[PDB]
Design a protein around this ligand. Structure first.
Ligand code: HEC
Ligand code: HEC
Lengths: 128, 128
């Protein structure tokens, strides 16, 4: 779906930006920085879940260069490591999605922690 | 929630990028440039619909300068005009959503044309 490799880069960056913004709204409630509203949390979680399925589809062959990319070469040269990182994130987001549907603060908070750990674990190995 | 103007600008840009990509996938089918797959068209339409509701929430006061923005000052000095352009888009996206639900190629093609017109109409007045 990307005509030029720059397109894949801008797409994945864009998806990550939207994920970070909506995930951050949920995290703010989990951290007690904003009052908890289960409906609003659920809406933001649903968006995170939808968006989470997008960026990791945009690291195809030849999408490694330029356009302000912060993807490390290891994304392509340690593809197994990158896939493990992606799968850990998908598993955490599944739990987050389930938590959003229950409206249980504790379950949401636990899943925010797991999800955030997956963001960081991938970035440590694969993002500048 | 945007902490600084840069955050609003990056968010809206990011959402428009994702919108353009998924909309373009549908458009390619409608224009007779790719085979028609109604399920895939519906999935991309549903994403467009979800996404369409995001960027126009990120043009608050003071988000008019810097950070690579291409928003024209008229976004804020003709707020009613910008809102009219946004509402025209939203109405077109409603029709695109309806078309995704039916799977009707002709209805999808009509809605792609209308939606595209709404992108262009807003850009002509409000985007550098
Ligand atoms: C690997 C499996 C990742 C997971 C899981 C998450 N992110 Fe990440 N992210 C990853 C890479 C390789 C990059 C660089 C993309 C590029 O081509 O430049 C990023 C980038 C981001 C960004 C910056 C986007 C930009 O500046 O344009 C953000 C804000 C971001 N990622 C956030 C983020 C969050 C909140 C995550 C968990 C919910 C997350 N990412 C997971 C790789 C991976
Ligand atoms: C006004 C009501 C708009 C409608 C409807 C659409 N877009 Fe637009 N778009 C608009 C503005 C004011 C801007 C500039 C945003 C900024 O702060 O820079 C944009 C930008 C884009 C972009 C570029 C994004 C980037 O990465 O910088 C794209 C790709 C884009 N818009 C596409 C697009 C499509 C496909 C639309 C219809 C489906 C559409 N936009 C509607 C204003 C408006």
């Amino acid at each position: 779906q990307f005509q030029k490799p720059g397109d894949a880069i801008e797409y994945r960056q864009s998806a990550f930006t939207l994920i970070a913004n909506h995930f951050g709204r949920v995290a703010a409630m989990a951290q007690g920085k904003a009052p908890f509203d289960a409906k609003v949390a659920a809406e933001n979680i649903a968006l995170v879940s939808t968006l989470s399925k997008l960026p990791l589809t945009a690291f195809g062959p030849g999408t490694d260069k330029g356009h302000g990319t912060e993807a490390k070469p290891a994304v392509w040269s340690d593809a197994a490591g990158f896939k493990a990182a992606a799968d850990k994130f998908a598993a955490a987001v599944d739990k987050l999605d389930a938590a959003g549907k229950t409206g249980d603060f504790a379950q949401i908070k636990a899943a925010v922690g797991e999800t955030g750990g997956a963001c960081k674990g991938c970035h440590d190995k694969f993002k500048e």
